[PDB]
Amino acid sequence: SEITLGKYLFERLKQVNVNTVFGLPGDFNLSLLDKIYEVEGMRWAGNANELNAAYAADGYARIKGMSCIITTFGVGELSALNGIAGSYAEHVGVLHVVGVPSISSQAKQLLLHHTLGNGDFTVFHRMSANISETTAMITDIATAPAEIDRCIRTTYVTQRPVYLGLPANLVDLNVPAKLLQTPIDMSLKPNDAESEKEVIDTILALVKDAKNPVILADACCSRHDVKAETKKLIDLTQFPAFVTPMGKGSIDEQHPRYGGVYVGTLSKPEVKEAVESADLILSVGALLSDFNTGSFSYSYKTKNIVEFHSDHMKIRNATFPGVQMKFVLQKLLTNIADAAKGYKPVAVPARTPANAAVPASTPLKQEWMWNQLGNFLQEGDVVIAETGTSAFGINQTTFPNNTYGISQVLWGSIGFTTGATLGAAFAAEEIDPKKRVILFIGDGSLQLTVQEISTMIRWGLKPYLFVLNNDGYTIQKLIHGPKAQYNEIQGWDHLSLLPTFGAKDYETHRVATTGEWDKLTQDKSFNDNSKIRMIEVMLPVFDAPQNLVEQAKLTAATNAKQ
Amino acid sequence: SEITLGKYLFERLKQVNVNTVFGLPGDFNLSLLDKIYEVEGMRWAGNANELNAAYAADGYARIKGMSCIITTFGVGELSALNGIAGSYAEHVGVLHVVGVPSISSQAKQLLLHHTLGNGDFTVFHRMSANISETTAMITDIATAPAEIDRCIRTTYVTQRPVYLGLPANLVDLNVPAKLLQTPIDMSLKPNDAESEKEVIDTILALVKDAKNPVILADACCSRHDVKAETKKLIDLTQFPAFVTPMGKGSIDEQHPRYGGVYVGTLSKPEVKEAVESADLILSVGALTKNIVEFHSDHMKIRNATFPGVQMKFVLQKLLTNIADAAKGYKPVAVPARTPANAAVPASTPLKQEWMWNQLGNFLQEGDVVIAETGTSAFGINQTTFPNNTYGISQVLWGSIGFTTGATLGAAFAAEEIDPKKRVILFIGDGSLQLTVQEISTMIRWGLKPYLFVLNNDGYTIQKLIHGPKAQYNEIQGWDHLSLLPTFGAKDYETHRVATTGEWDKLTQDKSFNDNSKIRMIEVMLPVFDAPQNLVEQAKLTAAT
Ligand SMILES: Cc1ncc(C[n+]2csc(CCOP(=O)(O)OP(=O)(O)O)c2C)c(N)n1
Ligand SMILES: Cc1ncc(C[n+]2csc(CCOP(=O)(O)OP(=O)(O)O)c2C)c(N)n1
Ligand SMILES: [Mg+2]
Ligand SMILES: [Mg+2]
């Protein structure tokens, strides 16, 4: 009938489909961590640092729904903040639990370790409040379970980080276990009825009038999961459907009505024209960041833009604050086919043609590779692309249906992906051990977070780690300073990283030509996720996707502008 | 004549003896970084991540006097914060410059990369203000030079981090070059004369009356440049002189009146007794109730505080007179140095107690000795240093992984000061994992530290306290000696030592003692092995 507060936390996490917990142990969280071992089906990742753990919790949340990272007071929590901030910016539900000193220790304002030496125990909490949806610092066992519940609810429903400070003295206190028999209620507060009705009615009327509507899926389509509603929207309507870089994967790219990746002026010409000639745009989850949009270059010819958002709706210039798109989309699906009844299906832009056959010795180039990559991918894959040439190139790759893309286009923290790949791999394993996790990471980016490969090995996770060796920071060389020393890096022996971190079941490969690329990626053995692999991909220093070359110039200009 | 604001920054850093700049590039700081190459004597480290860069800036400042790290808006600065916080906590003067979006980008609230997507360009600055002595976010070219000068002065004189945000557009605007011909004032303002004189008088009188006085040197002894003064204090008075763990290195341990390391109940029995039995204590730079506290920004004598009265100047003037006041003192015996290790067979497996005692044999004057949080930080308290040894042990903040970066920053600083100075790191296997990539940057710059890695298969210091077999205290086992070539080292040595004979043979070797190349030494130790001082506090945490 009773359970410790620490175990209560993990039982609640299990109820919200969290089975792996990220972070590192320290002075104020050890008794809490003990409780993981008491909950069947819960495991502790054992991360190699707190920043990487936060990146990993983000990757896990994207795939599983939410995540939890646990750190220790001061030294642990502050190391995580860049990971937390990226989860805030990108709308990823990560619960950050911090083990803190006992309530009396704080009251005595002792000169404890891991403090600023001034007796202020609130400072780190105050720092994190800036990048959290909400926070809690537990002080009272009587309200503790409700507060844990509140934090978990908020993390899941808002898909933003939440900070939960747990004093070490409270984790071993028993609370009634019966509390766990009432689930945390994840349902959304229903919309204002009148506002929602007006929104739905006017969208149906615009649909009835439109001769060339299009659907554009963006980040919040995925992050505030309306992927199922959006797929139904595409099917019931037959409208051409496009995706943004940040939303890529949110809609199935083998659907007959999929039209390609829209990136404003940086789109493939046919895609730009197909989208911008629309007489109605159904925009699901827009997040109009510089890199997502070719520096704010959208040029819709219609004023008829319907923006669906998690917390509001916009129709043309009219804003409907608080009207949540989930309920709007669900209700629209009931009548939308009828509204679309006039519609004569418009051709979608054709897929990029396959690469022409070339001699096997042809040196690898980016444009060739991103086009060729679609041959290797399979349904169910998680495909992760690091900020750098990889993030820009992957926009050119055609995904199989049911591909989960991760590209951190807004926050853009290089090194994120090594951690995200660990998190995505734990989550993928839990869902279906057949699902592959495929990473494209730059040589520069890998250096910032390389040690998290260690944690992949420790758990026998089997991602494909494609490392793009172009001898330094190519994306930056295109922005400014093509030969500047700050854009160069120490040259690593990438293929020795796995054995250096103690891998015992692995493969390494190197590819530098089109023949080598095709032979490796077509090999049946290589296509089974039987073990962790690293593939070093040798590419020219200044070679980059064409869209990045232009993006770089636009970005340099924006920064130098007086 | 005119110079860019960016080049102005690096000219000033040069003038205040900051010659290596840490951090990583990003679009918002690239134009700034170009300016490094325009200033002879300035270099860019090219760090492998920002947290490590901040750790390195901390090591550099400890040895050189102050440091500078440059990061990019949002993603870079937030990565650095645990480093910055440790520097705030331990009073290390690190200037954190962040390249931020242009003034026009901020005004128009452009939804740019590295923002939270909400148009708020103030948030990261506000976060850093919590762990900074002062901040500046530059908005006006006209007052930008004065603000840079203010930030640099404050970093050095307060020995705390300072945050300077530089919009990308402003770094390329021109300022009057003549400004550089007037130095930044980097000196402490003189003390209030009457207050300072009261303090000096009172101290002498307490000295005269004390039967069992001691000197105790703590963190701010070395950080605020009073090592020289303290040394003279020991000589003139001949009082027993002790250091704290954070102060270790700030008193030369070969002095006849040096009595050891005061670590409370974890001190050598004689040491604990000798300090705790004092009737007067001359406490230098702290970080019976008859205590004189010397601090960088104030003095305290028993219950009386003297705000603003700075120790640097009190100590100088005291020395002019101090000899007379202590002649009634009859030199009491200081605790004896720990006996050398007895001879044992060369095959004797290594244990920490033996190792920290033996380590003194290897160390030489001028060495920088860095010890990581974990068994290493406890063990080094047991090692006797040669004269002129600089210790780094982050006892207050205690962030594992700190030392890999600190070692990089210390090695750059030590190179600039004297190429013959060696940098010696003792880091645990666990801690190395958090910051391992910074070895890459050591190799890039041909730096030659000695990297001793304590392989005891996991987090021993935690295992001793809680969960001796808990999975969270275990780590993935790395091949440590492969790290150097994995990071592209060409000129290096690797060694493994598991016995006393192997330890002696290596560390006594003439070629090994020459800092001619980067070296890694993997030290094989038992899982539950630790120094006696840590075993003791394990029993204190026990006995419940
Ligand atoms: C944490 C962090 N620090 C710095 C940056 C700035 N930055 C953007 S791209 C980049 C280099 C990426 O290099 P690489 O991974 O080699 O990709 P490439 O373009 O060469 O494929 C850097 C340092 C960043 N985005 N995040
Ligand atoms: C950034 C950070 N995370 C976690 C901790 C908690 N912590 C203190 S000691 C320690 C273990 C250190 O292990 P190791 O470096 O192997 O030293 P050993 O005691 O084994 O010699 C940990 C995880 C910390 N102090 N700082
Ligand atoms: Mg690269
Ligand atoms: Mg260890």
GROMACS .gro file of C-alpha atoms in nm, chain B residues 109-477:
model
  369
  671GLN     CA    1   1.319   3.982  -3.392
  672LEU     CA    2   1.428   3.750  -3.675
  673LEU     CA    3   1.347   3.388  -3.601
  674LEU     CA    4   1.711   3.284  -3.618
  675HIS     CA    5   1.898   2.964  -3.544
  676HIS     CA    6   2.018   2.936  -3.183
  677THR     CA    7   1.711   3.123  -3.049
  678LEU     CA    8   1.425   2.974  -2.846
  679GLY     CA    9   1.194   3.074  -3.135
  680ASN     CA   10   1.023   3.343  -2.926
  681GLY     CA   11   1.216   3.654  -3.039
  682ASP     CA   12   1.388   3.701  -2.701
  683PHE     CA   13   1.756   3.785  -2.756
  684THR     CA   14   1.813   3.862  -2.384
  685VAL     CA   15   1.752   3.523  -2.231
  686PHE     CA   16   2.104   3.375  -2.243
  687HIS     CA   17   2.261   3.697  -2.116
  688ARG     CA   18   2.015   3.693  -1.831
  689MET     CA   19   2.105   3.331  -1.751
  690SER     CA   20   2.476   3.411  -1.746
  691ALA     CA   21   2.425   3.718  -1.518
  692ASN     CA   22   2.357   3.474  -1.235
  693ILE     CA   23   2.715   3.340  -1.254
  694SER     CA   24   2.907   3.655  -1.349
  695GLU     CA   25   3.063   3.937  -1.153
  696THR     CA   26   2.929   4.181  -1.415
  697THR     CA   27   2.795   4.173  -1.769
  698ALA     CA   28   2.800   4.396  -2.075
  699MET     CA   29   2.586   4.356  -2.383
  700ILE     CA   30   2.733   4.599  -2.635
  701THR     CA   31   2.479   4.813  -2.823
  702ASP     CA   32   2.673   5.134  -2.901
  703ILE     CA   33   3.008   5.160  -3.084
  704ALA     CA   34   3.076   5.491  -2.907
  705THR     CA   35   3.107   5.340  -2.558
  706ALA     CA   36   3.211   4.989  -2.669
  707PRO     CA   37   3.586   5.038  -2.597
  708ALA     CA   38   3.519   5.165  -2.244
  709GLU     CA   39   3.288   4.865  -2.185
  710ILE     CA   40   3.552   4.617  -2.308
  711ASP     CA   41   3.808   4.783  -2.078
  712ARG     CA   42   3.566   4.765  -1.786
  713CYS     CA   43   3.496   4.394  -1.844
  714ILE     CA   44   3.869   4.308  -1.870
  715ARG     CA   45   3.958   4.507  -1.556
  716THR     CA   46   3.673   4.352  -1.356
  717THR     CA   47   3.762   3.996  -1.465
  718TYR     CA   48   4.116   4.038  -1.339
  719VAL     CA   49   4.072   4.243  -1.023
  720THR     CA   50   3.773   4.045  -0.891
  721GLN     CA   51   3.896   3.710  -1.026
  722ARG     CA   52   3.543   3.616  -1.131
  723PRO     CA   53   3.389   3.558  -1.470
  724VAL     CA   54   3.248   3.846  -1.672
  725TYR     CA   55   3.009   3.819  -1.967
  726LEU     CA   56   3.056   4.041  -2.277
  727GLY     CA   57   2.806   4.012  -2.562
  728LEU     CA   58   2.931   4.145  -2.897
  729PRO     CA   59   2.681   4.185  -3.185
  730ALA     CA   60   2.826   4.053  -3.510
  731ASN     CA   61   2.781   4.386  -3.692
  732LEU     CA   62   2.956   4.594  -3.428
  733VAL     CA   63   3.285   4.398  -3.434
  734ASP     CA   64   3.369   4.544  -3.774
  735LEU     CA   65   3.294   4.908  -3.683
  736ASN     CA   66   3.593   5.132  -3.622
  737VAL     CA   67   3.711   5.293  -3.300
  738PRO     CA   68   4.001   5.534  -3.227
  739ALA     CA   69   4.332   5.335  -3.218
  740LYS     CA   70   4.484   5.591  -2.981
  741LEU     CA   71   4.267   5.447  -2.701
  742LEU     CA   72   4.506   5.150  -2.694
  743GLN     CA   73   4.795   5.376  -2.590
  744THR     CA   74   4.642   5.422  -2.245
  745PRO     CA   75   4.662   5.089  -2.054
  746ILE     CA   76   4.365   4.937  -1.881
  747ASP     CA   77   4.415   4.991  -1.510
  748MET     CA   78   4.461   4.633  -1.378
  749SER     CA   79   4.567   4.728  -1.026
  750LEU     CA   80   4.375   4.717  -0.702
  751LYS     CA   81   4.275   5.063  -0.581
  752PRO     CA   82   4.477   5.156  -0.270
  753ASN     CA   83   4.326   5.084   0.072
  754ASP     CA   84   4.162   5.340   0.299
  755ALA     CA   85   4.471   5.460   0.485
  756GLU     CA   86   4.328   5.477   0.838
  757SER     CA   87   4.146   5.144   0.812
  758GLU     CA   88   4.454   4.972   0.672
  759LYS     CA   89   4.664   5.121   0.954
  760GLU     CA   90   4.421   5.002   1.221
  761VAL     CA   91   4.436   4.648   1.079
  762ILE     CA   92   4.817   4.643   1.072
  763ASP     CA   93   4.836   4.761   1.436
  764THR     CA   94   4.590   4.517   1.577
  765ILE     CA   95   4.751   4.215   1.406
  766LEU     CA   96   5.093   4.288   1.564
  767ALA     CA   97   4.942   4.293   1.917
  768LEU     CA   98   4.772   3.955   1.875
  769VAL     CA   99   5.097   3.817   1.741
  770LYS     CA  100   5.286   3.932   2.052
  771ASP     CA  101   5.044   3.750   2.283
  772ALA     CA  102   5.009   3.419   2.093
  773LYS     CA  103   5.171   3.107   2.241
  774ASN     CA  104   5.067   2.863   1.968
  775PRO     CA  105   5.003   3.061   1.646
  776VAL     CA  106   4.991   2.915   1.295
  777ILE     CA  107   4.964   3.042   0.936
  778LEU     CA  108   4.697   2.876   0.718
  779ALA     CA  109   4.703   2.943   0.340
  780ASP     CA  110   4.380   2.877   0.143
  781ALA     CA  111   4.255   2.930  -0.216
  782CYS     CA  112   4.287   3.306  -0.239
  783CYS     CA  113   4.651   3.300  -0.129
  784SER     CA  114   4.761   3.204  -0.484
  785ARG     CA  115   4.467   3.353  -0.675
  786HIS     CA  116   4.530   3.706  -0.544
  787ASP     CA  117   4.909   3.708  -0.580
  788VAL     CA  118   5.004   3.698  -0.211
  789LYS     CA  119   5.221   3.383  -0.231
  790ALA     CA  120   5.536   3.600  -0.214
  791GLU     CA  121   5.406   3.794   0.086
  792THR     CA  122   5.298   3.479   0.261
  793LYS     CA  123   5.637   3.317   0.214
  794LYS     CA  124   5.802   3.617   0.386
  795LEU     CA  125   5.539   3.596   0.658
  796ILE     CA  126   5.644   3.237   0.731
  797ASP     CA  127   6.015   3.331   0.737
  798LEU     CA  128   5.982   3.633   0.967
  799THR     CA  129   5.753   3.475   1.218
  800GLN     CA  130   5.862   3.107   1.195
  801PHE     CA  131   5.509   3.008   1.290
  802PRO     CA  132   5.407   2.662   1.171
  803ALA     CA  133   5.258   2.708   0.819
  804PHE     CA  134   4.984   2.488   0.668
  805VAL     CA  135   4.779   2.484   0.348
  806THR     CA  136   4.424   2.373   0.271
  807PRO     CA  137   4.354   2.137  -0.023
  808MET     CA  138   4.254   2.439  -0.241
  809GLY     CA  139   4.560   2.631  -0.120
  810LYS     CA  140   4.806   2.348  -0.184
  811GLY     CA  141   5.102   2.479  -0.383
  812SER     CA  142   5.066   2.833  -0.246
  813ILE     CA  143   5.321   2.762   0.030
  814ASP     CA  144   5.650   2.595  -0.069
  815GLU     CA  145   5.641   2.254   0.102
  816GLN     CA  146   6.018   2.216   0.142
  817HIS     CA  147   6.025   2.504   0.394
  818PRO     CA  148   6.138   2.392   0.745
  819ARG     CA  149   5.829   2.553   0.898
  820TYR     CA  150   5.577   2.395   0.657
  821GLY     CA  151   5.359   2.165   0.868
  822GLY     CA  152   5.134   1.999   0.609
  823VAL     CA  153   4.784   1.999   0.465
  824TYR     CA  154   4.496   2.086   0.697
  825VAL     CA  155   4.189   1.884   0.588
  826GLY     CA  156   3.999   1.858   0.917
  827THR     CA  157   3.953   1.502   1.045
  828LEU     CA  158   4.126   1.383   0.725
  829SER     CA  159   4.456   1.555   0.811
  830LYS     CA  160   4.761   1.366   0.936
  831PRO     CA  161   4.712   1.330   1.316
  832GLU     CA  162   4.993   1.574   1.400
  833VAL     CA  163   4.859   1.826   1.143
  834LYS     CA  164   4.497   1.819   1.266
  835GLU     CA  165   4.615   1.865   1.624
  836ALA     CA  166   4.868   2.141   1.544
  837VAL     CA  167   4.611   2.360   1.364
  838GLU     CA  168   4.307   2.288   1.585
  839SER     CA  169   4.522   2.354   1.894
  840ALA     CA  170   4.635   2.699   1.778
  841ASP     CA  171   4.546   2.998   1.998
  842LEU     CA  172   4.591   3.238   1.702
  843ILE     CA  173   4.553   3.172   1.330
  844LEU     CA  174   4.682   3.389   1.047
  845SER     CA  175   4.440   3.282   0.773
  846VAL     CA  176   4.535   3.385   0.422
  847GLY     CA  177   4.264   3.377   0.156
  848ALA     CA  178   4.004   3.149   0.315
  849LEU     CA  179   3.736   3.016   0.080
  850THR     CA  180   3.969   2.903   1.877
  851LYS     CA  181   3.799   3.226   1.771
  852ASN     CA  182   4.128   3.423   1.769
  853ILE     CA  183   4.159   3.443   1.390
  854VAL     CA  184   4.302   3.703   1.152
  855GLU     CA  185   4.137   3.655   0.809
  856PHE     CA  186   4.320   3.808   0.512
  857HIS     CA  187   4.090   3.832   0.206
  858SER     CA  188   4.126   4.005  -0.129
  859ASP     CA  189   3.849   4.260  -0.067
  860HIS     CA  190   3.832   4.286   0.315
  861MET     CA  191   3.993   4.189   0.647
  862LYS     CA  192   3.849   4.032   0.959
  863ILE     CA  193   4.020   4.020   1.299
  864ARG     CA  194   3.822   3.809   1.545
  865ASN     CA  195   3.472   3.957   1.528
  866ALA     CA  196   3.578   4.287   1.372
  867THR     CA  197   3.536   4.324   1.000
  868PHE     CA  198   3.705   4.580   0.784
  869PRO     CA  199   3.511   4.605   0.457
  870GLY     CA  200   3.716   4.710   0.155
  871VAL     CA  201   4.050   4.660   0.328
  872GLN     CA  202   4.250   4.453   0.080
  873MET     CA  203   4.498   4.188   0.199
  874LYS     CA  204   4.762   4.246  -0.071
  875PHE     CA  205   4.858   4.584   0.080
  876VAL     CA  206   4.801   4.484   0.445
  877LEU     CA  207   5.046   4.196   0.400
  878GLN     CA  208   5.318   4.412   0.241
  879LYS     CA  209   5.322   4.671   0.519
  880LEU     CA  210   5.292   4.405   0.790
  881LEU     CA  211   5.613   4.247   0.661
  882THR     CA  212   5.808   4.575   0.691
  883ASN     CA  213   5.747   4.537   1.068
  884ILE     CA  214   5.638   4.179   1.159
  885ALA     CA  215   5.970   4.029   1.281
  886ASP     CA  216   5.974   4.223   1.611
  887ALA     CA  217   5.625   4.124   1.722
  888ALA     CA  218   5.697   3.748   1.723
  889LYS     CA  219   6.041   3.720   1.891
  890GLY     CA  220   5.876   3.608   2.218
  891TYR     CA  221   5.752   3.304   2.024
  892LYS     CA  222   5.971   3.000   2.078
  893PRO     CA  223   5.946   2.794   1.753
  894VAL     CA  224   5.725   2.501   1.820
  895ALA     CA  225   5.784   2.176   1.638
  896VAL     CA  226   5.593   2.132   1.311
  897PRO     CA  227   5.450   1.788   1.216
  898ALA     CA  228   5.711   1.568   1.044
  899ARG     CA  229   5.690   1.489   0.672
  900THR     CA  230   5.548   1.143   0.598
  901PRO     CA  231   5.831   0.887   0.590
  902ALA     CA  232   5.935   0.767   0.246
  903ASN     CA  233   5.783   0.438   0.135
  904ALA     CA  234   5.976   0.137   0.260
  905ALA     CA  235   6.142  -0.074  -0.013
  906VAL     CA  236   5.908  -0.341  -0.146
  907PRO     CA  237   5.951  -0.599  -0.427
  908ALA     CA  238   5.924  -0.451  -0.778
  909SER     CA  239   5.619  -0.674  -0.846
  910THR     CA  240   5.416  -0.523  -0.559
  911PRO     CA  241   5.075  -0.427  -0.697
  912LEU     CA  242   5.013  -0.053  -0.695
  913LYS     CA  243   4.792   0.093  -0.421
  914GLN     CA  244   4.689   0.456  -0.385
  915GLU     CA  245   4.844   0.507  -0.043
  916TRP     CA  246   5.183   0.402  -0.179
  917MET     CA  247   5.140   0.600  -0.503
  918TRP     CA  248   5.058   0.945  -0.360
  919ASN     CA  249   5.352   0.913  -0.119
  920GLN     CA  250   5.587   0.806  -0.401
  921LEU     CA  251   5.466   1.077  -0.642
  922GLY     CA  252   5.685   1.339  -0.469
  923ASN     CA  253   5.989   1.166  -0.619
  924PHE     CA  254   5.872   1.237  -0.974
  925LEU     CA  255   5.765   1.599  -0.930
  926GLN     CA  256   6.014   1.884  -0.997
  927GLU     CA  257   6.017   2.260  -0.926
  928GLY     CA  258   5.803   2.454  -1.169
  929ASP     CA  259   5.550   2.171  -1.223
  930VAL     CA  260   5.178   2.234  -1.250
  931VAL     CA  261   4.997   1.943  -1.078
  932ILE     CA  262   4.627   1.895  -1.152
  933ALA     CA  263   4.407   1.648  -0.965
  934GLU     CA  264   4.049   1.553  -1.054
  935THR     CA  265   3.754   1.530  -0.819
  936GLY     CA  266   3.748   1.165  -0.708
  937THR     CA  267   4.022   0.965  -0.537
  938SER     CA  268   4.284   1.184  -0.711
  939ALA     CA  269   4.178   1.505  -0.535
  940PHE     CA  270   4.197   1.330  -0.198
  941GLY     CA  271   4.521   1.149  -0.280
  942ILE     CA  272   4.715   1.455  -0.391
  943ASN     CA  273   4.672   1.601  -0.039
  944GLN     CA  274   4.914   1.327   0.068
  945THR     CA  275   5.183   1.411  -0.189
  946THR     CA  276   5.473   1.638  -0.096
  947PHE     CA  277   5.547   1.901  -0.361
  948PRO     CA  278   5.886   2.046  -0.453
  949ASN     CA  279   5.915   2.421  -0.414
  950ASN     CA  280   5.738   2.635  -0.678
  951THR     CA  281   5.467   2.380  -0.758
  952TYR     CA  282   5.130   2.505  -0.871
  953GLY     CA  283   4.838   2.283  -0.762
  954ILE     CA  284   4.495   2.280  -0.926
  955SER     CA  285   4.216   2.088  -0.742
  956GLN     CA  286   3.860   2.216  -0.788
  957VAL     CA  287   3.756   2.121  -0.433
  958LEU     CA  288   3.463   2.360  -0.400
  959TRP     CA  289   3.283   2.330  -0.734
  960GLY     CA  290   3.390   1.968  -0.786
  961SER     CA  291   3.289   1.914  -1.143
  962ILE     CA  292   3.430   1.588  -1.274
  963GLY     CA  293   3.584   1.624  -1.621
  964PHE     CA  294   3.708   1.976  -1.535
  965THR     CA  295   4.069   1.861  -1.537
  966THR     CA  296   4.098   1.750  -1.901
  967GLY     CA  297   4.015   2.106  -2.006
  968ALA     CA  298   4.207   2.270  -1.722
  969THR     CA  299   4.513   2.069  -1.832
  970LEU     CA  300   4.488   2.212  -2.184
  971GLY     CA  301   4.459   2.572  -2.054
  972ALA     CA  302   4.739   2.521  -1.802
  973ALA     CA  303   4.970   2.374  -2.072
  974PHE     CA  304   4.913   2.675  -2.302
  975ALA     CA  305   4.981   2.917  -2.013
  976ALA     CA  306   5.284   2.726  -1.892
  977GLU     CA  307   5.430   2.718  -2.243
  978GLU     CA  308   5.397   3.097  -2.265
  979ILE     CA  309   5.561   3.141  -1.923
  980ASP     CA  310   5.845   2.887  -1.941
  981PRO     CA  311   5.870   2.597  -2.190
  982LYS     CA  312   6.053   2.391  -1.926
  983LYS     CA  313   5.748   2.385  -1.697
  984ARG     CA  314   5.571   2.051  -1.693
  985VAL     CA  315   5.196   1.995  -1.662
  986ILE     CA  316   5.096   1.680  -1.478
  987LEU     CA  317   4.738   1.552  -1.462
  988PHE     CA  318   4.588   1.288  -1.238
  989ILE     CA  319   4.239   1.209  -1.367
  990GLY     CA  320   4.007   0.920  -1.296
  991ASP     CA  321   3.883   0.680  -1.566
  992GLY     CA  322   3.525   0.797  -1.492
  993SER     CA  323   3.600   1.169  -1.513
  994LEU     CA  324   3.805   1.137  -1.829
  995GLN     CA  325   3.493   1.018  -2.010
  996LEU     CA  326   3.311   1.347  -1.971
  997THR     CA  327   3.575   1.563  -2.142
  998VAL     CA  328   3.803   1.318  -2.325
  999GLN     CA  329   3.798   1.503  -2.657
 1000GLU     CA  330   4.002   1.792  -2.521
 1001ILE     CA  331   4.310   1.568  -2.557
 1002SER     CA  332   4.257   1.640  -2.929
 1003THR     CA  333   4.331   2.011  -2.877
 1004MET     CA  334   4.648   1.930  -2.681
 1005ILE     CA  335   4.770   1.728  -2.980
 1006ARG     CA  336   4.670   2.003  -3.231
 1007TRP     CA  337   4.894   2.251  -3.051
 1008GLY     CA  338   5.183   2.010  -2.978
 1009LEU     CA  339   5.136   2.053  -2.601
 1010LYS     CA  340   5.320   1.799  -2.385
 1011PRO     CA  341   5.125   1.726  -2.061
 1012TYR     CA  342   5.165   1.404  -1.862
 1013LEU     CA  343   4.822   1.247  -1.850
 1014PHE     CA  344   4.795   0.993  -1.566
 1015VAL     CA  345   4.470   0.806  -1.588
 1016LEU     CA  346   4.362   0.613  -1.275
 1017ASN     CA  347   4.196   0.298  -1.405
 1018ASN     CA  348   4.003   0.152  -1.114
 1019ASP     CA  349   3.710   0.037  -1.328
 1020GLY     CA  350   3.448   0.298  -1.244
 1021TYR     CA  351   3.345   0.563  -0.995
 1022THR     CA  352   3.540   0.458  -0.689
 1023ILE     CA  353   3.482   0.759  -0.470
 1024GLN     CA  354   3.106   0.702  -0.502
 1025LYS     CA  355   3.132   0.324  -0.457
 1026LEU     CA  356   3.307   0.386  -0.123
 1027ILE     CA  357   3.006   0.591  -0.001
 1028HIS     CA  358   2.699   0.440  -0.171
 1029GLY     CA  359   2.633   0.149  -0.409
 1030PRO     CA  360   2.967  -0.034  -0.429
 1031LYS     CA  361   2.826  -0.253  -0.710
 1032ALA     CA  362   2.549  -0.025  -0.838
 1033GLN     CA  363   2.538  -0.014  -1.217
 1034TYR     CA  364   2.529   0.369  -1.213
 1035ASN     CA  365   2.878   0.361  -1.056
 1036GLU     CA  366   3.018   0.140  -1.335
 1037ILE     CA  367   3.146   0.266  -1.668
 1038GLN     CA  368   3.200   0.136  -2.019
 1039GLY     CA  369   3.561   0.017  -2.035
   0.00000   0.00000   0.00000
